[PDB]
Amino acid sequence: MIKKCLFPAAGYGTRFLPITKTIPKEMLPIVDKPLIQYAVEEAMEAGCEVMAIVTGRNKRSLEDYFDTSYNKENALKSIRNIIEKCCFSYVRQKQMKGLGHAILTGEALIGNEPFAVILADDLCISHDHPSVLKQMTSLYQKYQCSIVAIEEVALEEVSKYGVIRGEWLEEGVYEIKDMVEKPNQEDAPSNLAVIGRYILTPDIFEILSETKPGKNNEIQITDALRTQAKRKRIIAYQFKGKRYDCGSVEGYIEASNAYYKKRL
Amino acid sequence: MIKKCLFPAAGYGTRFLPITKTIPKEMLPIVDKPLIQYAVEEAMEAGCEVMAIVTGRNKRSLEDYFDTSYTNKENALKSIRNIIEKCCFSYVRQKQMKGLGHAILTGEALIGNEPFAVILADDLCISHDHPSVLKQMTSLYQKYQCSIVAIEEVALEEVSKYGVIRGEWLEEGVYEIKDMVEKPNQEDAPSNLAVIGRYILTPDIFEILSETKPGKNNEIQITDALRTQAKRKRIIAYQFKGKRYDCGSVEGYIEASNAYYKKR
Amino acid sequence: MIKKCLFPAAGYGTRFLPITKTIPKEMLPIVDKPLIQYAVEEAMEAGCEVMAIVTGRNKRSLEDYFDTSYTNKENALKSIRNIIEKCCFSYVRQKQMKGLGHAILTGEALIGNEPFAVILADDLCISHDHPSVLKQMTSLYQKYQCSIVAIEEVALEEVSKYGVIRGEWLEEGVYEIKDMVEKPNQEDAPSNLAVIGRYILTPDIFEILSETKPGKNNEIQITDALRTQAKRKRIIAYQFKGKRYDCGSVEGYIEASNAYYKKRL
Amino acid sequence: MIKKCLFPAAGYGTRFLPITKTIPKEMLPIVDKPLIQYAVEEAMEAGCEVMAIVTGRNKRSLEDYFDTSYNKENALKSIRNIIEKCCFSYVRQKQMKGLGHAILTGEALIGNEPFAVILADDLCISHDHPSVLKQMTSLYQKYQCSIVAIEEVALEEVSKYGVIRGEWLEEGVYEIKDMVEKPNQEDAPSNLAVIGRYILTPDIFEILSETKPGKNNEIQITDALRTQAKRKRIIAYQFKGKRYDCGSVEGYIEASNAYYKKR
């Protein structure tokens, strides 16, 4: 059982400025509910009980949201159940040096165990099938190796994401042969894009500590995974469910509008 | 002239629950900018230099936002830093949620014996070729030297969500209020002229507020005190020029968000 | 009746570094109670109902302290709770540390055109055989209707840490101020009547502050503004009754603490 | 070696009420320095690099204190050093259910590894000797078992501390036979009182899980240590150095006066 889920939330969110100068992008609402809460509910379903959060300058709002306070009830029951059932842990990333560096800072909260990772700006809704992390948690029980979530996208979208090169194993399961962070579409090894959902074995921490800066001069978890994938097998998983890239303004709006209609 | 502008920001904003349990509704972003920043910019253009805020349970986000901090990251941060170095922010806590009228009364400590502006940031006002709604009102005030409340004609099916006036046409877009009613059913609406979150208030409004008893939804309403003033002397209603989105409602919040995005 | 009291609390408190990088010096406890609570309680006894606080970077400790959160806990809590339920707290941020004078000028947005009280919390005043210091002053304002600044006689050796006045005796404990100087060297002191952190100021003090240039330590001094006011019209100095500890200094901080302990005992 | 140090800071501090309403007692200043800063310096000297803090209802002041900010320089040298060298982690103790429970909560920040624990209200000032934790860190190296700092106190004081029953192994080292939390004078098994300094082997977490409320209906680390002591060998170390119980106002005052004189 993967008991810990690490949530990186120390990124600038330069694109949602000026509000991200105070409110982490992971705290932005889809209308009435922050991205991070959906992520937490997801991790819970997957079986996690310890939500480890890596924070930046804007630690306050994130931390206060998950601390004790006070169809109203309806709106507050889930966050209340979250606060009661989960143990929240926090560590501060001293400098914005990349996603990989964030996860490496998170070592203080994880220790020597495989663990889950959720990039909250990727809102994944699947409510017909188990949550995305849960799908991967079940896969992990069989494979016992790092797992990276993937989705087919248009080549025109590739330069925004990590892209793999994999060899089919079973339905929707690939053994990652190679990975590249944000390639030009001409250089993209496939249309299989990485999404903010991973299950990582702890040897990943030692690998991160020796992973140099890459794309945008940031320590990328992609390069660490590429290294791991060349020492032993790690898999990529085409999850079932809907994903909105809320790290993008386009995705943020479409998720908000979708929710609005659902609310009807 | 009007140098202070009171910003009530201590209501529950329940329909936006659970995020409002930590993030006040005035802090919700259209996409990248919180409602309150638009209101503040509108107050500045109107000549205000003191931004007085009535806080509730979660003022941490507000105070943090207007406190100094550290291409389009530059252009995204230009106005806010201008606001922070230019304006003077003061604060007072509304002990209990007893109505917009009480929040204004509580705001007396920050105002004193002087006419002032009041902005309800949940009403996002966009004036493109015209001055900000408050600036328009500021001009009016120079002539009339009396309370002024912003109105707009709305379909009668909406009249039940707002305060409504019965008035005498003084001049182009100007009426003398002879009565006001907070949230009447369609059957009883005095007219289709609804009140929006913009007011200029003479200071005798505080003693009136001091004697105003709970009204609609067991809340001390600014509408009821304005009715009292209206019957003691002349106050006016101004059909402002410009587009207003009621972001106090999810439907308005969503429309404003879609609007800003298309303009991006 | 003076209803508002301004509490400057935006200073650095350098002598209490590193703790003052997070906890403003006015929040430092005498053992179990921060300096500022004693000040607020004193203002309340004087009749003030609005506690206008000028903040700096350490606002959080101050703001949270006076906000709602709550014979064991009880008795130790009754006072602060009474305070939080009866008083109205307002805040303004002194954008930059430019001096007590500029801190009070920044405080104008919370005061307005009315006379008001000012308390410098690092000056702990205990005097319960008589009314609190500020209240002694509030009574005096009723008569004189002008600015009042608290003074205490000190040794020529301490004179250099305070503002000092030159006055003329009007009546018991009252002096019409003829001149004021901030932190004069022991040789240049006009007297031994040193100013302490307590004032009642008439509203014209703001306009005077707006034209007061940086004085000692390149900071705008309320002292220089009071000197200006004193030469313009009548303003007095009141020799208060009660004991005062300069908790603005580590020596006075320790003394008051030991003093309180010997009492808690 | 021991890389992490746990710092419980979630207790009520009813003693120092009202200020402890907003500020944790571990944050109370001696004169210009908060208790917790002395403890962190001590831990650092002991070789610790991860400072794991267990927080309560008032974490803002403690977290902000150890977060980047900006003789003023002589005053900020240490904390600047600390903030730039240490890794601080946080976890919330939901209900104040005792020191042992606070430590159990800290499991998420520790994991399965030996770790140190410092109760910051116990101010330990080592003159010519290394820090109390450094002394213990060295001892563990030899013993490889839980270590609990002790001090011989006066019998009339015994009732406010955990007390051991031990057997002399070597200079200032006792194998613990039993432990009781805050026994009355008449029932004290000795005059060797526990002080807020421990090195603990990870099996203490499971034991703590099984430890029911004891003294003052609180889950006590002393009872978990007692259980560990009967289960296998653990030691008590009579440290070299001066200790003030700043958990009591009398101690707080004495420490403040002492620091003042150092001038």
Ligand SMILES: O=c1ccn([C@@H]2O[C@H](COP(=O)(O)OP(=O)(O)O[C@H]3O[C@H](CO)[C@@H](O)[C@H](O)[C@H]3O)[C@@H](O)[C@H]2O)c(=O)[nH]1
């Ligand atoms: O120094 C940092 C940088 C980022 N983050 C956080 O890490 C996450 C991801 O950051 P972001 O910049 O938004 O990453 P992306 O550019 O979107 O890319 C990541 O996520 C994509 C899918 O969303 C993948 O396809 C990529 O391979 C992966 O790098 C966010 O939660 C950030 O707040 C930190 O905590 N610290």
Ligand SMILES: O=c1ccn([C@@H]2O[C@H](COP(=O)(O)OP(=O)(O)O[C@H]3O[C@H](CO)[C@@H](O)[C@H](O)[C@H]3O)[C@@H](O)[C@H]2O)c(=O)[nH]1
């Ligand atoms: O106790 C309170 C209650 C409200 N507010 C604030 O007051 C404002 C308005 O609150 P809201 O709940 O949204 O009131 P409405 O029902 O929208 O009604 C007000 O605003 C309408 C238009 O926006 C008008 O038409 C109404 O007459 C007027 O009462 C917001 O800024 C709130 O945060 C407080 O600060 N404290």
Ligand SMILES: O=c1ccn([C@@H]2O[C@H](COP(=O)(O)OP(=O)(O)O[C@H]3O[C@H](CO)[C@@H](O)[C@H](O)[C@H]3O)[C@@H](O)[C@H]2O)c(=O)[nH]1
């Ligand atoms: O920029 C500033 C500077 C100071 N303060 C505050 O002002 C007060 C006084 O500051 P402090 O540095 O302690 O001034 P002192 O040197 O003590 O001097 C003041 O107080 C003395 C007695 O306490 C008097 O005798 C002096 O005339 C008077 O200037 C404190 O509450 C500070 O926090 C601010 O708020 N902002």
Ligand SMILES: O=c1ccn([C@@H]2O[C@H](COP(=O)(O)OP(=O)(O)O[C@H]3O[C@H](CO)[C@@H](O)[C@H](O)[C@H]3O)[C@@H](O)[C@H]2O)c(=O)[nH]1
């Ligand atoms: O629920 C709690 C209760 C306490 N604490 C912390 O635990 C520590 C100790 O609390 P305290 O109340 O001061 O305990 P003491 O009564 O002093 O007793 C402890 O410390 C003594 C020495 O100081 C020992 O002799 C005792 O055996 C040991 O229980 C402090 O750091 C507290 O903040 C928590 O974090 N959570």
Ligand SMILES: [Mg+2]
């Ligand atoms: Mg970006």
Ligand SMILES: [Mg+2]
């Ligand atoms: Mg992203």
Ligand SMILES: [Mg+2]
């Ligand atoms: Mg985009």
Ligand SMILES: [Mg+2]
């Ligand atoms: Mg509502």
Ligand SMILES: [Mg+2]
């Ligand atoms: Mg509204």
Ligand SMILES: [Mg+2]
């Ligand atoms: Mg709606």
Ligand SMILES: [Mg+2]
């Ligand atoms: Mg100083």
Ligand SMILES: [Mg+2]
């Ligand atoms: Mg001083």
Ligand SMILES: [Mg+2]
């Ligand atoms: Mg000194």
Ligand SMILES: [Mg+2]
């Ligand atoms: Mg206690």
Ligand SMILES: [Mg+2]
């Ligand atoms: Mg103790």
Ligand SMILES: [Mg+2]
């Ligand atoms: Mg005691």
